[PDB]
Ligand binder design. Structure first.
Ligand SMILES: *[C@H](CC(=O)OC)C(=O)NNC(=O)CCc1ccccc1C(=O)N[C@H](C)c1cccc2ccccc12
Ligand SMILES: [Zn+2]
Ligand SMILES: [Zn+2]
Ligand SMILES: [Zn+2]
Length: 311
């Protein structure tokens, strides 16, 4: 005796199966997951009739379908993803100032910061798995998106995480082709060395929190040997993310889009989100806090942009 279930790798192309109800899912298909739960080892239950199961791909049809949804051939991915989903599906995603945050759980403050940031910057993702899961997170259903961010970043539920680190990972999976940053460097010896940057390196700088400061200039070690200073000529990008190791910093309403607060030490600290709406909101999972100024330990500041030229 049998029942009728659907299997997929992407959740777009379903593939109806007839399952022997006395063998396990593992023997009939392969490693198999329902709603993120591993079900490799259980026998088809009667309520499982008419439900979608994620499976690894055997067929090259499914191997191509998985690539075109996830842009990864990596065999471990779909499992690492389903593993996360099983947890993130249990997380609570409260609206907090019409933003989808995550109630703190299974160590997720950095994810909640990254997620809140990702709803305030104009980001087009390349893996359809991600672009779809995002759109859904925007609308409050954010389990899937968090699971993928974890999988795509090689992190797991419980692991601690840098926001700078988690963003660059995602920027790398985002169309930032038309992003261009022209630098200029001047040592009084080397001469006048003008670099161009495209893509992810165009929209991140580790060094100062201050977009203003970068435009004026910041001192560097330089090509020839020693003493030189580098300043932003041009920046065509829809945003830039200025990072630097946690200082104390005054955030003023209207000078910046949003920021990452980091209390504590390297790799054993707690993150909060500062966003500049009518006032400065500070978001800590499900806890909103507003304030006209904000001095605290800032490490990442996102600025909105499209085209800037120097003088
Ligand atoms: C939240 C923890 C929680 O949920 O508790 C309620 C969480 O996951 N926090 N993340 C971390 O603690 C992990 C921090 C981390 C991980 C890897 C690499 C760097 C970092 C990190 O500490 N980043 C911070 C911002 C940092 C970056 C660069 C320099 C520097 C210098 C001094 C302190 C901190 C940093
Ligand atoms: Zn890709
Ligand atoms: Zn030099
Ligand atoms: Zn600790």
């Amino acid at each position: 005796r049998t029942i009728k279930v659907f299997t997929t790798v992407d959740n777009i192309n379903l593939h109806t199966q007839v399952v022997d109800m006395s063998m396990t899912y593992g023997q009939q298909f392969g490693p198999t997951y329902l709603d993120g739960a591993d079900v490799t080892k259980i026998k088809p239950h009667n309520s499982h009739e008419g439900k979608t199961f994620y499976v690894l791909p055997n067929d090259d049809t499914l191997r191509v379908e998985a690539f075109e949804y996830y842009h990864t051939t990596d065999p471990s991915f779909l499992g690492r993803y389903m593993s996360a989903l099983n947890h993130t599906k249990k997380w609570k995603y409260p609206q907090v100032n019409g933003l989808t945050s995550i109630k703190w759980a299974d160590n997720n403050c950095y994810l909640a910061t990254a997620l809140l940031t990702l709803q305030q910057i104009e980001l087009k993702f390349n893996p359809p798995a991600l672009q779809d899961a995002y759109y859904r997170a925007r609308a409050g259903e954010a389990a899937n998106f968090c699971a993928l961010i974890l999988a795509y970043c090689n992190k797991t539920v419980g692991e601690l995480g840098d926001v700078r680190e988690t963003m660059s990972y995602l920027f790398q999976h985002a169309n930032l082709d038309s992003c261009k940053r022209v630098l200029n460097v001047v040592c009084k010896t080397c001469g006048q060395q003008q670099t161009t940057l495209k893509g992810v390196e165009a929209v991140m700088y580790m060094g100062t929190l201050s977009y203003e400061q970068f435009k004026k200039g910041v001192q560097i070690p330089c090509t020839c040997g020693k003493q030189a200073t580098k300043y932003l000529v041009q920046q065509e990008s829809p945003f830039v993310m200025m990072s630097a190791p946690p200082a104390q910093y005054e955030l003023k309403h209207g000078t910046f889009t949003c920021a990452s607060e980091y209390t504590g030490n390297y790799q054993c600290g707690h993150y909060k989100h500062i966003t500049s709406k009518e006032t400065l909101y500070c978001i800590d999972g499900a806890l909103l806090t507003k304030s006209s100024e904000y001095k605290g330990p800032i490490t990442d500041v996102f600025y909105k942009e499209n085209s800037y030229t120097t003088t």
